[PDB]
Design a binder for this molecule. Structure first.
Ligand SMILES: O=C(O)/C=C/c1ccc(O)cc1
Ligand SMILES: O=C(O)/C=C/c1ccc(O)cc1
Lengths: 162, 162
């Protein structure tokens, strides 16, 4: 039920058609919480069946969203990063092959960072907690910081490899 | 087939029984590439069926591992971080509820960081590319940097919330 709360959250600022929900997943929401098309309407069906939407949130849906929002949950198990599995097995690579693999990864992370920086610039063309775009600013700065940090770590490791 | 290359990689430094593979997933490998018990023996069966292991790697298994190691792959889609979905929907929280949620997350990330720091200290009790423990050092420093960066971002956001 990976889309339950994304969808309830989308409806938090008032009614939307299904096309409009589908369209929200093609924009900024789908960079960090991607949906498959085949998941969306079945989730919409379940949510309606559960009393949480009728698409507008019901009182019940608002409560369900709110309860999830404030719930403190343990940090989950680490996300499997296939690149890092390779790094774990680096003993099986020559120094030159390690360099090539890490350099390729560094290029890709820097490239992803430039795409994020373009998105940031668009968003920011005076941020505060009270801004309506604060949630968007949170997911975009989180992604910026994550990729900057990855780039920094890769540069450090390459200085050990090279 | 999420365990294919983890398992081929484990066998890269010579023969192991299944218990010994199961035991490796309970240690450091299972912090960033967790296995379910129910996945391991079925993967072992497939790998044997495919000619990649007989447990020792065959020539074929070594080549398969090597080919995967050097393959340049696109960066995958972002890992769904359920906390970040909440942050995206922060408009539905009061300033006080936002503070409580972010503070709880900050405590948990700092806690995870102390566990990682204990693991680092153990590992490091003169690191180089040539060390046999370089792969372990890579996955542990990556995890350290990732959680330090998360903590830093959380502290920044809390200074905006508070
Ligand atoms: O998590 C990511 O990789 C990307 C997040 C993102 C968030 C908002 C945007 O406007 C663009 C990308
Ligand atoms: O990715 C993680 O969260 C943890 C990784 C980790 C790697 C090596 C260790 O010795 C402990 C934790």
């Amino acid at each position: 039920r990976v889309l339950k709360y994304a969808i309830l959250g989308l409806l938090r600022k008032g009614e939307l058609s299904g096309y409009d929900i589908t369209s929200y997943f093609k924009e900024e929401l789908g960079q960090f919480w991607s949906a498959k098309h085949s998941q969306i309407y079945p989730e919409l069906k379940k949510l309606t069946d559960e009393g949480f939407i009728t698409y507008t949130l019901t009182d019940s849906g608002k409560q369900e969203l709110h309860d999830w929002l404030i719930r403190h949950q343990p940090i989950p198990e680490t996300v499997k990063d296939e690149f890092m599995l390779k790094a774990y097995f680096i003993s099986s690579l020559s120094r030159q092959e390690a360099s090539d693999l890490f350099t390729d990864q560094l290029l890709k992370r820097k490239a992803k960072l430039s795409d994020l920086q373009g998105s940031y610039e668009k968003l920011m063309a005076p941020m505060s907690f009270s801004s309506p775009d604060f949630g968007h600013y949170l997911v975009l700065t989180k992604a910026l910081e994550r990729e900057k940090n990855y780039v920094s770590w890769l540069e450090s490791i390459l200085a050990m490899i090279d």
